[PDB]
Design a protein around this nucleic acid. Sequence first.
DNA 1: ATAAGTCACATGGTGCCGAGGCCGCTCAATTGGTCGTAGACAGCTCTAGCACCGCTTAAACGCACGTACGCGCTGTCCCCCGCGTTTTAATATTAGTGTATTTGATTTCCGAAAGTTAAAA
Length: 79
Amino acid sequence: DNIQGITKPAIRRLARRGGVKRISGLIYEEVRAVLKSFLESVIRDSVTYTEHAKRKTVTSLDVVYALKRQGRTLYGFGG
DNA sequence: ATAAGTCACATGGTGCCGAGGCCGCTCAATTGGTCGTAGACAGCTCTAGCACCGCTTAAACGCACGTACGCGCTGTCCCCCGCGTTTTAATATTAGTGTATTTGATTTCCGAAAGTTAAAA
């Protein structure tokens, strides 16, 4: 629906940051696959956090929290 | 001439206006003091260590050597992209409503604490 919004030139630019200088196609659609997996996992964690807080605004507190839970502590925004 | 009197003078004092000078109330967390209990300890004994020999022959290392194997080789297939181009959708602006959070006053909630005792190798 909008995973295509993460588009092939955009992931090309990501891969320029990655240091590549040749990239085939199917790389692209599966980069969308891995991004889907990452987003849904962390989103589920933050969602569970807020809904246990009986709130309905998943919040950066719960996002940095879900990230630390996933094992990677994004860092700079409180936390 | 002088007691009465008017008069102006001279000083009194009373009233109001800032204003710079002390003061009053509160909350931080210190430190003062004090109970009661973790902590280090006080004789201690015995654990599994870790040597300390004293064997054996099971691994193991080299001695040989051999296919397997690698590693660039090499025609060539192929694919990625560097752009060039049209698209194309990503800007990033307002917006009010529609809960989302939210912070008061409770107001029950419930388990830590204090008995009392069940159970327990």
